[PDB]
Amino acid sequence: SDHKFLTQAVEEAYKGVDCGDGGPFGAVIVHNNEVVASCHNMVLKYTDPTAHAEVTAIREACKKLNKIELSECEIYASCEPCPMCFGAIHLSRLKRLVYGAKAEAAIAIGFDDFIADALRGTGVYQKSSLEIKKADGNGAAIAEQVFQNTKEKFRLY
Amino acid sequence: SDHKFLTQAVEEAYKGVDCGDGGPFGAVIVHNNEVVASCHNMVLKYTDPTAHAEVTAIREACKKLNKIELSECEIYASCEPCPMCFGAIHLSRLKRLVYGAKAEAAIAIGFDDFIADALRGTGVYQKSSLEIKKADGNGAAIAEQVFQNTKEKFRLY
Numbered sequence: 001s002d003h004k005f006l007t008q009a010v011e012e013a014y015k016g017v018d019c020g021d022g023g024p025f026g027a028v029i030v031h032n033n034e035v036v037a038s039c040h041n042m043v044l045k046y047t048d049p050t051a052h053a054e055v056t057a058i059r060e061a062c063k064k065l066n067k068i069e070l071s072e073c074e075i076y077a078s079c080e081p082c083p084m085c086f087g088a089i090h091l092s093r094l095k096r097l098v099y100g101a102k103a104e105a106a107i108a109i110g111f112d113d114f115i116a117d118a119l120r121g122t123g124v125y126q127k128s129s130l131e132i133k134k135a136d137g138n139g140a141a142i143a144e145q146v147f148q149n150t151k152e153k154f155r156l157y
Numbered sequence: 158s159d160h161k162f163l164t165q166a167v168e169e170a171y172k173g174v175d176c177g178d179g180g181p182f183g184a185v186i187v188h189n190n191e192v193v194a195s196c197h198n199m200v201l202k203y204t205d206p207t208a209h210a211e212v213t214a215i216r217e218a219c220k221k222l223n224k225i226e227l228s229e230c231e232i233y234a235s236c237e238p239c240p241m242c243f244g245a246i247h248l249s250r251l252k253r254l255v256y257g258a259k260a261e262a263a264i265a266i267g268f269d270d271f272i273a274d275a276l277r278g279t280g281v282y283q284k285s286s287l288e289i290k291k292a293d294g295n296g297a298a299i300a301e302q303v304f305q306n307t308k309e310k311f312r313l314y
């Protein structure tokens with residue numbers, strides 16, 4: 001099931017840059033194999049620097065399910081969530097995070113050197129016990145190639 | 158000016174508690190002593206766990222100025238911003254953060270131990286460079302009093 005939803009997130013990233021909504025980032029939120037939300041970065045469309053793919057997906061899922069906690073749900077991120085998005089995933093009580101590409105793949109095409117300490121377990125104050133899976137092989141390679149594929153199609157932010 | 162806008166953020170916290178919008182947290186974004194945004198936590202009102210006071214104020218200031226960067230603006234938070242909110246402040250390019258109460262004041266009345274390493278200077282993968290001021294004296298007293306005054310007046314989240 002992981003490959004399918006990670007692929008959906010990657011396709012959301014491509015779709016979002018293609019229609020100009022934002023950068024090449026997708027996020028899918030799933031409730032026991034049922035897709036709750038499927039979104040991409042909307043920073044450009046919304047004029048909202050917090051409208052990353054993960055935050056947008058969390059907002060949509062929470063509005064659809066009429067609750068502020070997503071503890072029965074899991075999130076699939078095309079790219080490793082940034083500090084803001086990882087904080088949002090923590091606050092939303094999502095129980096599992098699967099992400100495709102490492103943050104360095106996005107940094108390689110000019111994005112901020114902006115990595116979540118709690119995700120990589122490098123913090124003093126912020127800890128995390130959230131189940132985190134970094135994808136490997138198939139979908140991981142496809143997810144990593146997103147930034148080289150789309151870097152000519154959008155403006156950095 | 159610092160005390161004025163910090164007190165306004167505290168007032169926003171009290172207002173949001175009184176109207177049931179969310180928790181006792183406020184945020185005021187200013188541009189050269191002109192208020193661009195004045196907000197409080199809207200998590201309960203919006204059914205949105207990302208709708209912290211700081212994130213809400215950033216969204217509204219970015220809408221008000223029709224741009225996704227606030228490099229000319231400063232933010233005043235009633236309480237020390239959480240990791241999600243501090244990441245949002247980073248992405249917003251806000252030039253200065255003034256916060257009133259340490260996060261322990263909010264933890265002491267039931268909120269998560271959820272502290273931003275990059276704000277306290279203990280981050281490894283996240284390094285802020287914006288100017289940060291922790292309020293002292295009367296501002297600190299007011300901000301800390303927020304949490305004892307609003308105890309059991311709102312619903313925890």
Ligand SMILES: Nc1[nH]c(=O)nc2c1ncn2[C@@H]1O[C@H](CO)[C@@H](O)[C@H]1O
Nearest residue numbers: 025041052053081082085111112114
């Ligand atoms: N929709 C999104 N979701 C997310 O988590 N991060 C995003 C993002 N759009 C751009 N970024 C930046 O990507 C780099 C590596 O994470 C960091 O510089 C981030 O600021």
Ligand SMILES: Nc1[nH]c(=O)nc2c1ncn2[C@@H]1O[C@H](CO)[C@@H](O)[C@H]1O
Nearest residue numbers: 182198209210238239242268269271
């Ligand atoms: N509107 C808000 N803005 C913010 O930054 N943090 C908020 C918050 N509402 C609750 N919190 C929690 O307060 C504690 C210390 O910050 C952490 O547990 C946070 O999760």
Ligand SMILES: [Zn+2]
Nearest residue numbers: 052081082085
């Ligand atoms: Zn993010």
Ligand SMILES: [Zn+2]
Nearest residue numbers: 209238239242
């Ligand atoms: Zn916050």
